[model samples]
Target: SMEQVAMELRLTELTRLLRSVLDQLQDKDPARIFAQPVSLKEVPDYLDHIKHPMDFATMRKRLEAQGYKNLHEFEEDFDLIIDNCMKYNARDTVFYRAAVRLRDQGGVVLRQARREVDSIG
Candidate 1:
């Protein structure tokens, strides 16, 4: 009985965290600052599925170079990445598109960090 109660509480907390993460991701507008491509040939392909697992360390470095210092910042910028990728068909769109890839690689890192802070004891 005590275990069940604890489990329920943990579930509630997890739901809350999941909703918050979704909301944050939903709020950003990647197309807010759209960059019109000069030429089709010049456009880079952001939608390409990663052929191999993306290196988290490299991804973090790439993201940091774009000024997303933390997950909150990274997620907020996600829309921009999403939009740019959609617009130019170039870069990192696959990161979000691949269910297993992002979770196992980048998303898990952020989700775990968030969970650690809010995990039910």
Candidate 2:
């Protein structure tokens, strides 16, 4: 039962950590593209470029449901969101610019998360 308890604690910690990071991303949104997934109706060609799209709402659900196995996995989704934005949008677009800013800003947030998670058991 000791390891079982530890597993639950880890999951609980990870959920809150991911949520905090998601909140930071929302706050730092320059063009606000990460708020939700891209719509196929508006941007019909989005999936043609971005095969593995990620978004804030998706991450929010995963956090509330404790869907991630670890902090690193959560970070993976965060990274994919920025990358998808940068890749799918045109170089001159504001969305691409926001992706660059978010990428750097998010680096600090994840690094902070690493230290916080490591400080735990």
Candidate 3:
């Protein structure tokens, strides 16, 4: 299982790094590329390499260059994690609700991200 691999691979260390960055990004406007072009460009590459903090960090910076200025920019990817966690992390109802919120909020973020990016581009 991926979760098992995450455990064995010490994904917590990576997740901790993500948490720190996420803390910094919590309210920033997310990039809207996710909603318009149906791409993951707006998805900060933070989790692409959860096994390597440096790799994730590098990816995060690369995405940030694409105009992602906030935690919301990465919410689509974050929502996926939240959903997966909700389904697997003891099946907690609270986490499930959190995942739902992330999903809906991600849409708003996507719209905002796209609008802003379009305005600038």
Q: Score each candidate by Cα lDDT.
A: 0.41, 0.84, 0.44
Error of 3 at 2 (Å): 44
Pairing residues by index, what is the TM-score of model 2? 0.89
Poorest stretch of ten by lDDT in candidate 1:
29-38
Per-prediction TM-score = 0.32, 0.89, 0.36
RMSD (Cα, Å) for all candidates, in order, is 13.1, 1.6, 16.9
Residue runs of model 2 more than 4 Å from their true location after superposition = none
Which tens-of-lDDT digit does each residue in 24-66 have in candidate 1? 4333323322222223364344334322222223334444343
What would the C-alpha RMSD of candidate 2 be, to one decimal place? 1.6
Q: Which digits, one per residue and each the tens of the lDDT, describe model 3 over residues 1-121?
A: 9888755444344344445444344433243211221123654653453322222244355454443334354554555454544543354565456445556664655565556544643
Collision pairs in model 2:
none
Better of 2 and 3 by lDDT: 2
Residue ranges of candidate 3 with Cα displaced over 4 Å: 1-76, 89-92
**What residue runs in model 1 are displaced by over 4 Å at the alpha carbon?**
30-121
Instruction: At residue 61, give the lDDT of candidate 3.
Output: 56
